[PDB]
Amino acid sequence: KKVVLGKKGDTVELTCTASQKKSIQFHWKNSNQIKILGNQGSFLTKGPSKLNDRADSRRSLWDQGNFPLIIKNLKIEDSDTYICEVEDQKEEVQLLVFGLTANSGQSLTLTLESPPGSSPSVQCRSPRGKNIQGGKTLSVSQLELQDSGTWTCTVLQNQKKVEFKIDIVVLAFQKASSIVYKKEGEQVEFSFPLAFTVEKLTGSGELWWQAERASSSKSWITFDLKNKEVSVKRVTQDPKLQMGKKLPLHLTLPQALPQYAGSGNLTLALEAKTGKLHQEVNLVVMRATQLQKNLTCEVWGPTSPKLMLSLKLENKEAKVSKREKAVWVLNPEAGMWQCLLSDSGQVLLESNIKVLP
Amino acid sequence: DAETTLFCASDAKAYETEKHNVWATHACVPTDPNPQEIHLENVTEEFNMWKNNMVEQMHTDIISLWDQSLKPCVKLTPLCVTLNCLINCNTSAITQACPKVSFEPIPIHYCAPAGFAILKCKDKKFNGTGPCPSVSTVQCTHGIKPVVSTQLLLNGSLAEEEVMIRSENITNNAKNILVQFNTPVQINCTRPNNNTRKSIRIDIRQAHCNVSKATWNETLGKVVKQLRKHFGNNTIIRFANSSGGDLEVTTHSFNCGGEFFYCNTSGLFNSTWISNTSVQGDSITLPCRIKQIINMWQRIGQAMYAPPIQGVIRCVSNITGLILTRDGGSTNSTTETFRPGGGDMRDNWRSELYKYKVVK
Amino acid sequence: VSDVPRDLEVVAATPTSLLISWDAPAVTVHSYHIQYWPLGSYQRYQVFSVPGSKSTATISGLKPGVEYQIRVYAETGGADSDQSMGWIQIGYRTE
């Protein structure tokens, strides 16, 4: 009858019950007709299977009449059909066990461990919401620093599902790119997690930033790291940057503004191994608001030309859309409008405005 | 089929300090001096034996004897609280006086009450849960001793003409196989004095038993002759020791005056078998050991008794039965493993109350 | 040919201890690094090292009923640039 799923390494339980809620003779058998365990009164006698050591049952639950089967430290090789044996009728429970592991920069591979004959589908969404669908093996080719939180993989068989969580960290000074999209006034955060080996090397670094204007070829702070202690050498007057003292490199902008925009370079050198470390960083800033009649949404920073800006209420259609960096509506309609800076597939920056007149 | 109570009837003494004589005097009647066995005609009755409710009564009439005989010093027993699931399950200990009392079984007879009758098969094989034809009615069963033991059924009745095996269902390796012998295999267990050495570093806990090898091989030679009749197909009878568990199951366990002998039975089941022997070629030294912290057979929970007697502990027993399990499976490559089992005392009395049934 | 540990699994656990086993890659392993941290907070990771010849590892000092993530790296000495540092990662939870 019943079907039970399980997470690799978890503990699950196949509950069997009969009519008489007391101590009476019962046992468990697998597909191969091997005794799983036996009982002499209250005490438990061990079954001949190789899972005898790992698998177990609750002696305490004999009062209610329930005859549970417990499998601590579930392995892939446990998926099977099990039979509860009271002489009047046998209840069978079919069991499939899955497991999730991550093999192998800018790309990672995920391998899903599956039992035989299974026909499963595997969704996995990022912390930022990126929805990735796949089969037995999933490959994440292109990663950016923003997509470095906790990823959630939901595995589905025919109708029944099991949920797995796995953390993903993207190394800063590898080829992976860093980009941050903020509307004006939101504080900006940059994190540059380094590989565990380089934490004890010690070194010094700085960040240079360039805005829209060619005047600011270089700027921004300079800092020294020894042991797991981050100490700044010099800080720019215009941004009130806050860098975290603790070892994970944490850098904060109090709030995002258009002048604080443009590509930047972060360079870390270290006397230990003497290898020049570079890092690319971008910040894109949106301002969307209506002054008097006019309604305006514009974006500042280094944006690919391909992407598109639109002003639209999701109820109606886009009142104006152009491939330019600035979009403006004249004598605009009443409603809950939106400004969307967007790629082909997905939206990069969404702002929700509401006009009153 | 009735579900009544049966009054016991044993030949007591009412004068000695023997425990069973004290219990039998307060709740048992004297034995019937003139029994009558009316032989029925051409009748057939489906004598099921594993669903017999009469054995469920004897087991509850013996537990009431052990609570009047061997009072434990510390009776640690579990006790849970009705809380769904951290279930509150705290132990509840009881401290009682522990006087070393005498201990010896006495044959009792379960008799039918007023208005009911007890049937009895008389076939020399009987097969267990199969219908026989020589059904005769009686009013009281034969001599039944309340001996509590594991892996080897002690003192009791022997088979009629041939060693028969009984099991609720074969080939399912869960039900124990009761083997009844047709010849009394003796056993003597002693420790005279000579070992007053209490500890070793900061022996009285040692005893031994002997089995007549020249006599025991005959009875074992007939058991394999019957087991191969059930599996005569490239498979092989291979005995072995226990597969582990509690110390009252891994080894033999019987009692003699509060001495809870835990006899290691590995030099008795180690031999592999075929139509020929693999033992040797008189006095098989069955190493035993008196214990003090036991696991009760009358429910879950440990116990702790008083230290053993100074000396001269003798057990001139018999061996009438044998409890054997079976190890089957898909890895069974033409073999037959019969490890010693037992522990369920209901199975100890089903080997004795198989001939009867209470009918109205 | 990849040089990444495979077949990582939890052999046995206690509310305070994990005992894990993996399988060695193809190339010579100079040492295996065990990096484990609770779910979400990468920053609170703890890492230790065992020599390239041992196949299992004990992990002590764990909290009951807690999700943890376990990553095992392998570093191969014999190849300076022919091969790199790989890792396999799974998750588990103490009772």
Curated annotation (Swiss-Prot), chain A:
Disulphides: C16-C84, C124-C153, C297-C339
Extracellular face residues: 1-357
Top-level taxon of the source organism: Eukaryota
Location of the protein in the cell: Cell membrane
Tissue and organ distribution: Highly expressed in T-helper cells. The presence of CD4 is a hallmark of T-helper cells which are specialized in the activation and growth of cytotoxic T-cells, regulation of B cells, or activation of phagocytes. CD4 is also present in other immune cells such as macrophages, dendritic cells or NK cells.
Free-text description of this protein's post-translational modifications in UniProt: Palmitoylation and association with LCK contribute to the enrichment of CD4 in lipid rafts.
The UniProt record lists the keyword Transmembrane: yes
Effect caused by changing R234W: In OKT4-negative populations
Outcome of substituting F43I: Abrogates the interaction with MHCII and T cell activation
GO biological process: adaptive immune response; calcium-mediated signaling; cell adhesion; cell surface receptor protein tyrosine kinase signaling pathway; cell surface receptor signaling pathway; cellular response to granulocyte macrophage colony-stimulating factor stimulus; cellular response to ionomycin; defense response to Gram-negative bacterium
Domain text: The Ig-like V-type domain mediates the interaction with MHCII.
Disorder cited: Immunodeficiency 79: An autosomal recessive disorder characterized by childhood onset of recurrent and recalcitrant skin warts due to uncontrolled viral infection with human papillomavirus (HPV). Some patients may also have recurrent respiratory infections. Laboratory studies show a complete absence of CD4+ T cells.
Subunit and partners: Forms disulfide-linked homodimers at the cell surface. Interacts with LCK. Interacts with PTK2/FAK1. Binds to P4HB/PDI. Interacts with IL16; this interaction induces a CD4-dependent signaling in lymphocytes. Interacts (via Ig-like V-type domain) with MHCII alpha chain (via alpha-2 domain) and beta chain (via beta-2 domain); this interaction increases the affinity of TCR for peptide-MHCII. CD4 oligomerization via Ig-like C2-type 2 and 3 domains appears to be required for stable binding to MHCII and adhesion between T cells and APCs. Interacts with Aedes aegypti long form salivary protein D7L2. (Microbial infection) Interacts with HIV-1 Envelope polyprotein gp160 and protein Vpu.
UniProt-recorded name of the protein: T-cell surface glycoprotein CD4
Gene: CD4
Residues of the full protein shown: 26 to 388 of 458
